[PDB]
Design a protein around this ligand. Structure first.
Ligand SMILES: [Mg+2]
Ligand SMILES: [Mg+2]
Ligand SMILES: [Mg+2]
Ligand SMILES: [Mg+2]
Ligand code: NA
Lengths: 142, 178, 48, 153
RNA sequence: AGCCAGAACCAGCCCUACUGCAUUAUCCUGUCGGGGGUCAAAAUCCGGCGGGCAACGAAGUGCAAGAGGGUCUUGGUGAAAUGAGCGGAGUAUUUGAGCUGGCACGGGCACGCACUCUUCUCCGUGAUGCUCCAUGUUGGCGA
RNA sequence: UUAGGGAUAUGUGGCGUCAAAACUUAUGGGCUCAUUCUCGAUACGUAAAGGGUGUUGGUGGCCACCGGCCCCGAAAAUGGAUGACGCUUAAGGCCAAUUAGUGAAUGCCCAUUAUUCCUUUGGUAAGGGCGGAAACGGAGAAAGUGUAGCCCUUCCGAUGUA
RNA sequence: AUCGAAUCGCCACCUACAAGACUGGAGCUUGCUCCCUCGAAGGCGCCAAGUAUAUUCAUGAUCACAAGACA
């Protein structure tokens, strides 16, 4: 409750863990990922592809550069990802992060498969979002 | 859409005095855009017919009379209007509408178009719904025919405001610009 | 004219209710100069 | 041919808050205005409509002018014009438009894959039939060149 | 911490959210008679008397009280944060709405004057600081 | 009706293009066709009698009279002016709306004006501090018309020839 | 050869033609009825050459001209 406490957040309810989000900026613009959690002290979200489907690794992202759709996946993974995982000292991946990626991605894929509509959800995660001529994004539901 | 004039009943009197301890109470029916204009018309009528000024008068009541249920009827409207050249002229005209306020609004627009007469130069003497067998004008009588039917020709149909376009493909519906 | 405010017309946005959706969004004008000058990530990403 | 404006005629609303709803004409005021009502719809109580805002359909329930609600409800039910209107392709197009307006990113993806599947199978079938009867430009050219290649080369 | 970006939070300001009471009668509804018209009967219309709330968006009648978005339109990151908003303590307090027992109001009281539903309450930080300036987070650029 | 600048909202005037605004609004009603200056269309500001079955309505008895738009009546000196182009299911003329018989106060655009915020300057200006508390984040602290203004806080005015 | 640059849908199914007092075809009751193409969509394209447990993506580290490119 206390604003100084790290548990304090103000994230909008749409960006809840297990929601499928569209990336709007950065190297992975247009891909679809799954929101895992929000870092403490009202920090960024962390998302993963999983990397098998669309090639998006575990990554931090501001909630203002994401569209959180209404499609959800039930997640019950170990979610042992603190702030220290993304802090570095003052094709190459460390042998700890490389292991964390697998440990999370296997559980996430098991969750998607266990979900109903699993095949459709997998294809949905593989597809790419773009703005076509004649499109009106301001009129849509998400 | 809805008529621009409302129907008001205004009841008033002159303020009592030692000369007139119990003044006469008067009732007035007017069609006006709001109750302030309605009261202005009431006090003008009192001034020109009863020699009573607003500065020595009381307004007992001022309300709006509700319309009846919407039904297609014939309305006879007895109206009068002034102009400098002709003078004061009195007309009786029949209209088709669904309410008294609608018929009177029709009459005001009609007078504005065919005689250039403005609101403050017009007095409405009466308005009432009449039966089908008292209609004199054939242009109104034609709508009683029980077999009335006609097609809609030469229509100017516009698209919904969200779908309007500037340039479209000639035989299709695709928009090129907007 | 007052040049501190610009007017922008966007494709398929033809209504005031439509245009309200974009209040707060970021906007960019892209062009080119005559020489190569400094940019974001001039050192990290020389491809830019 | 054209559908005349008459008492008992079915219409569809074009613009405004009642857009794409069906009513029945119960009275004609003048050349511009009619009274419309549909008892089996929530927002279609008896009201006034301008004749530029309506679309006359092909059905007419046979009733007299300024009829009662009781006499119009059963006349509709007996005519079964609503069950007939629900089977045309313009009615289905209206329902499809509403369904498309209310749709999520997942449903748009589903529609995209359905259309892609249809196109793939269509082009496969076309290739198979063009093998028998050559109708493509490349097959017409191939058959035109085969006779020439049979000589010499 | 120099320069240039992005996001968050606090104070202020500016927008959009969330709203009840009165009034309906020239009205609503059922019969009877008339009048109307049709191929027959219904309606528009008038007069008798029986009831009444047109009450899901019924009036477009009068008066209304009910946190989400900006701040490259401001200042800041707690160097005295005065807060219904930050803290301590409990669970009750008292605002209305229904329903209750002298004078007023009209020719009975629609409920003026005096003595069950519905909501959060009480307490706190002076300047031995007269004035000014010095305090976040994440990247880009600068070795 | 005017100090130097932001934001919000208005006045007169507007919303087919020139030219910001109905990307040519409405789920409002009438009326009007004009062929060599010519239908008409922002006041102040630069044509009359009399005629017309052209078309639309009104009064009284198919008639006589009174209206609305339009047409004759209407003839000068460089080529030229609703400001130009153009407009006729108007972009004209009279009336009336605000997203429309749905169910509740403000469609939109533009000022050296209004409200509000920042800074300057001047007042018939209005308050406060100025015996160095002590110790040891930084410095300063003047009894003062006027300064690089002794230092803070507050309110109101600001154009101008001779 | 200078040259780095702004632009971000493709098609040998649109890329033929007329009408809007009227328009798929019949009737005769000429404004209704009946038939069926049902009279309100150019085709594709948007990440497995196609709807199916196939498959490399990271360190380009949280926005920055898309560090890509003419399907
Ligand atoms: Mg413009
Ligand atoms: Mg001063
Ligand atoms: Mg001066
Ligand atoms: Mg680039
Ligand atoms: Na002009």
């Amino acid at each position: 409750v206390s604003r100084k406490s790290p548990e304090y957040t103000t994230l909008r309810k749409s960006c809840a863990p297990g929601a499928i989000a569209i990336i709007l900026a950065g190297r992975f613009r247009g891909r679809r990922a799954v929101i895992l959690k929000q870092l403490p002290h009202n920090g960024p979200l962390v998302v993963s592809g999983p990397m098998k489907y669309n090639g998006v690794p575990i990554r931090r992202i501001d909630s203002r550069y994401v569209i959180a759709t209404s499609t959800t996946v039930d997640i019950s993974s170990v979610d042992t990802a603190p702030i220290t995982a993304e802090v570095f000292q003052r094709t190459l991946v460390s042998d700890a992060r490389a292991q964390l990626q697998k440990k999370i991605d296997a559980a996430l894929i098991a969750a998607i498969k266990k979900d109903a509509q699993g095949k459709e959800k997998a294809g949905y995660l593989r597809s790419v979002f773009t703005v076509k001529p004649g499109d009106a994004p301001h009129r849509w539901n998400w | 859409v809805k008529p621009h004039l409302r129907h008001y009943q205004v009841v008033g009197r002159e303020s009592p005095s030692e000369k007139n301890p119990e003044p006469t109470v008067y009732k007035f029916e007017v069609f006006a855009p709001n109750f302030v204009v309605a009261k202005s018309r009431f006090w003008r009528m009192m001034r020109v017919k009863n020699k009573v000024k607003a500065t020595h008068g009381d307004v007992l009541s001022c309300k709006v009379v509700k319309d009846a249920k919407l039904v297609a009827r014939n309305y006879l409207v007895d109206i009068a209007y002034y102009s400098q050249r002709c003078g004061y002229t009195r007309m009786v005209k029949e209209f088709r509408d669904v309410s008294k306020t609608g018929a009177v609004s029709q009459a005001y627009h009609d007078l504005a178009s065919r005689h250039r007469a403005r609101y403050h130069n017009i007095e409405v003497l009466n308005v009432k719904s009449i039966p089908d067998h008292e209609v004199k004008h054939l242009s109104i009588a034609q709508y009683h025919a029980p077999n009335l039917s006609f097609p809609l020709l030469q229509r100017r149909t516009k698209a919904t405001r969200k779908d309007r376009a500037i340039f479209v493909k000639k035989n299709t519906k695709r928009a090129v610009v907007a | 004219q007052t040049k501190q405010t610009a007017l922008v017309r966007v494709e398929n946005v033809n209504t005031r209710e439509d245009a309200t959706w974009y209040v707060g969004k970021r906007v960019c004008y892209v062009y080119h100069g005559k020489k190569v000058k400094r940019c974001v990530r001039w050192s990290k990403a020389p491809a830019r | 041919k054209s559908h005349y404006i008459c008492a008992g005629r079915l219409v569809r609303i074009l613009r405004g808050p009642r857009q794409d709803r069906v009513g029945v004409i119960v009275d004609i005021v003048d050349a511009n205005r009619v009274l419309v009502e549909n008892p089996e719809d929530a927002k279609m109580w008896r009201h006034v409509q301008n004749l530029k805002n309506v679309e006359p359909l092909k059905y007419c329930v046979s009733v007299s002018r300024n009829c009662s609600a009781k006499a119009l409800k059963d006349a509709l039910a007996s005519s079964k014009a609503l069950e007939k209107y629900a089977k045309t392709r313009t009615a289905a197009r209206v329902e499809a438009k509403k369904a498309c307006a209310v749709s999520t990113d997942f449903e748009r993806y589903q529609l995209r894959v359905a259309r892609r599947s249809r196109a793939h199978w269509a082009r496969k079938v076309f290739d198979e039939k063009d093998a028998k009867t050559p109708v493509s430009w490349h097959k017409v050219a191939l058959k035109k060149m085969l006779k020439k290649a049979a000589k010499m080369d």
